[PDB]
Design a protein around this motif. Structure first.
Motif, PDB file in Angstrom:
ATOM      1  N   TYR B   4       5.108  34.107  35.290  1.00  0.00           N
ATOM      2  CA  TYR B   4       5.710  33.469  36.448  1.00  0.00           C
ATOM      3  C   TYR B   4       5.935  32.000  36.089  1.00  0.00           C
ATOM      4  O   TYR B   4       7.047  31.493  36.156  1.00  0.00           O
ATOM      5  N   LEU B   5       4.892  31.268  35.421  1.00  0.00           N
ATOM      6  CA  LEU B   5       5.047  29.928  34.941  1.00  0.00           C
ATOM      7  C   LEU B   5       6.106  29.826  33.874  1.00  0.00           C
ATOM      8  O   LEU B   5       6.928  28.942  33.903  1.00  0.00           O
ATOM      9  N   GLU B   6       6.110  30.759  32.950  1.00  0.00           N
ATOM     10  CA  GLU B   6       7.163  30.818  31.986  1.00  0.00           C
ATOM     11  C   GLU B   6       8.516  31.020  32.627  1.00  0.00           C
ATOM     12  O   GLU B   6       9.469  30.353  32.304  1.00  0.00           O
ATOM     13  N   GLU B   7       8.589  31.916  33.588  1.00  0.00           N
ATOM     14  CA  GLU B   7       9.851  32.151  34.271  1.00  0.00           C
ATOM     15  C   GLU B   7      10.314  30.929  35.047  1.00  0.00           C
ATOM     16  O   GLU B   7      11.463  30.570  35.031  1.00  0.00           O
ATOM     17  N   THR B   8       9.397  30.298  35.726  1.00  0.00           N
ATOM     18  CA  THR B   8       9.706  29.134  36.478  1.00  0.00           C
ATOM     19  C   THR B   8      10.226  28.021  35.587  1.00  0.00           C
ATOM     20  O   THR B   8      11.252  27.455  35.823  1.00  0.00           O
ATOM     21  N   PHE B   9       9.542  27.779  34.507  1.00  0.00           N
ATOM     22  CA  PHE B   9       9.933  26.788  33.551  1.00  0.00           C
ATOM     23  C   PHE B   9      11.273  27.032  32.944  1.00  0.00           C
ATOM     24  O   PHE B   9      12.016  26.138  32.687  1.00  0.00           O
ATOM     25  N   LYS B  10      11.544  28.271  32.665  1.00  0.00           N
ATOM     26  CA  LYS B  10      12.784  28.699  32.112  1.00  0.00           C
ATOM     27  C   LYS B  10      13.971  28.303  32.988  1.00  0.00           C
ATOM     28  O   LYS B  10      14.930  27.726  32.528  1.00  0.00           O
ATOM     29  N   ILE B  11      13.796  28.481  34.294  1.00  0.00           N
ATOM     30  CA  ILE B  11      14.749  28.056  35.308  1.00  0.00           C
ATOM     31  C   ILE B  11      14.885  26.551  35.327  1.00  0.00           C
ATOM     32  O   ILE B  11      15.957  26.009  35.407  1.00  0.00           O
ATOM     33  N   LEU B  12      13.755  25.884  35.236  1.00  0.00           N
ATOM     34  CA  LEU B  12      13.681  24.449  35.246  1.00  0.00           C
ATOM     35  C   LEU B  12      14.298  23.798  34.012  1.00  0.00           C
ATOM     36  O   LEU B  12      14.958  22.794  34.144  1.00  0.00           O
ATOM     37  N   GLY B  13      14.192  24.466  32.864  1.00  0.00           N
ATOM     38  CA  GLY B  13      14.898  24.201  31.629  1.00  0.00           C
ATOM     39  C   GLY B  13      16.408  24.192  31.615  1.00  0.00           C
ATOM     40  O   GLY B  13      16.976  23.457  30.840  1.00  0.00           O
ATOM     41  N   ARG B  14      17.018  24.899  32.583  1.00  0.00           N
ATOM     42  CA  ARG B  14      18.455  24.887  32.930  1.00  0.00           C
ATOM     43  C   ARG B  14      19.010  23.542  33.221  1.00  0.00           C
ATOM     44  O   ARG B  14      18.288  22.598  33.337  1.00  0.00           O
ATOM     45  N   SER B  15      20.301  23.422  33.144  1.00  0.00           N
ATOM     46  CA  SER B  15      20.869  22.119  33.150  1.00  0.00           C
ATOM     47  C   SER B  15      20.727  21.292  34.434  1.00  0.00           C
ATOM     48  O   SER B  15      20.391  20.124  34.338  1.00  0.00           O
ATOM     49  N   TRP B  16      21.024  21.818  35.605  1.00  0.00           N
ATOM     50  CA  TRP B  16      20.879  20.988  36.807  1.00  0.00           C
ATOM     51  C   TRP B  16      19.647  21.272  37.661  1.00  0.00           C
ATOM     52  O   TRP B  16      19.466  20.668  38.684  1.00  0.00           O
ATOM     53  N   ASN B  17      19.018  22.399  37.407  1.00  0.00           N
ATOM     54  CA  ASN B  17      18.086  22.977  38.354  1.00  0.00           C
ATOM     55  C   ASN B  17      16.938  22.080  38.748  1.00  0.00           C
ATOM     56  O   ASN B  17      16.610  21.982  39.910  1.00  0.00           O
ATOM     57  N   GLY B  18      16.312  21.429  37.789  1.00  0.00           N
ATOM     58  CA  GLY B  18      15.214  20.590  38.129  1.00  0.00           C
ATOM     59  C   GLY B  18      15.627  19.447  38.998  1.00  0.00           C
ATOM     60  O   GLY B  18      14.996  19.105  39.968  1.00  0.00           O
ATOM     61  N   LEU B  19      16.755  18.888  38.657  1.00  0.00           N
ATOM     62  CA  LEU B  19      17.347  17.850  39.445  1.00  0.00           C
ATOM     63  C   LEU B  19      17.663  18.244  40.896  1.00  0.00           C
ATOM     64  O   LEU B  19      17.364  17.515  41.810  1.00  0.00           O
ATOM     65  N   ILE B  20      18.258  19.406  41.087  1.00  0.00           N
ATOM     66  CA  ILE B  20      18.599  19.909  42.402  1.00  0.00           C
ATOM     67  C   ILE B  20      17.370  20.033  43.276  1.00  0.00           C
ATOM     68  O   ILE B  20      17.341  19.644  44.424  1.00  0.00           O
ATOM     69  N   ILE B  21      16.338  20.547  42.687  1.00  0.00           N
ATOM     70  CA  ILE B  21      15.076  20.674  43.350  1.00  0.00           C
ATOM     71  C   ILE B  21      14.531  19.304  43.806  1.00  0.00           C
ATOM     72  O   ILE B  21      14.089  19.137  44.925  1.00  0.00           O
ATOM     73  N   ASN B  22      14.570  18.339  42.896  1.00  0.00           N
ATOM     74  CA  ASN B  22      14.118  17.004  43.154  1.00  0.00           C
ATOM     75  C   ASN B  22      14.924  16.348  44.251  1.00  0.00           C
ATOM     76  O   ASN B  22      14.416  15.693  45.131  1.00  0.00           O
TER      77      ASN B  22
END
Ligand SMILES: *c1c(C)c(O)c2ccccc2c1O
Ligand SMILES: *c1c(C)c(O)c2ccccc2c1O
Lengths: 100, 99
Positions: B4-22
């Motif tokens: 689940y952490l790996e999966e989550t990180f994998k998503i977060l590793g994507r280009s905009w995703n972490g930013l969108i969340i923030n």
């Protein structure tokens, strides 16, 4: 800060990497690995284990010191950056458990 | 507790995703209209924004809400899981900053 995080994520996203620095932080008794059990069993080839350890090292998470060739004995000790990263990890680890 | 952490990180590793969340963490009611996000993130093409939002949606981090205040509004809200994640990210931001 932006692509540092995105990259670190991406590394973390890949499979072992997350689990490995768990060990390095936790299972260590002196914050070094010396390849013990060459990992604790688990589903993973050292072909791909070796790959991941390399990735860690490239991102200054980890450092390796070959102690002695004549037989070859290899540590794999964690850095400050690594130690810190493990420290930062704890809340998301906790979170992950709540939702699963 | 694992991939689940790996999966989550994998998503977060994507280009905009972490930013969108923030972004959404930082927005009121943790909620932004599509076009707010689009201008605010400078460079994201709205093709992309949608695609990313769908991903985080699928993940259950973002909820899309249609408000039938018709002239319409479409808003993207952070789910409790998403908000909790954003909080969880903060030490990692801090860590990155230090380096
Ligand atoms: C880039 C930036 C600039 C910031 O602030 C965050 C915050 C949290 C997760 C990811 C980020 C990225 O990628
Ligand atoms: C799986 C496990 C079991 C643990 O403990 C961690 C810890 C930190 C990051 C990622 C992990 C994964 O994927």
């Amino acid at each position: 800060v932006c692509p540092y995080l995105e990259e670190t994520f991406k590394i973390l996203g890949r499979s072992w990497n997350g689990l490995i620095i768990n060990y390095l932080s936790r299972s260590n008794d002196s914050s070094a690995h010396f390849s013990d059990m060459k990992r604790d069993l688990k589903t993973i080839t050292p072909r791909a284990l070796s790959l991941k350890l390399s990735e860690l090292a490239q991102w200054e998470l980890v450092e390796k010191q070959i102690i002695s060739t004549s037989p070859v004995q290899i540590i794999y000790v964690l850095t400050e950056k690594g130690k810190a990263l493990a420290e930062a990890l704890h809340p998301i680890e906790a979170w992950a458990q709540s939702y699963v």
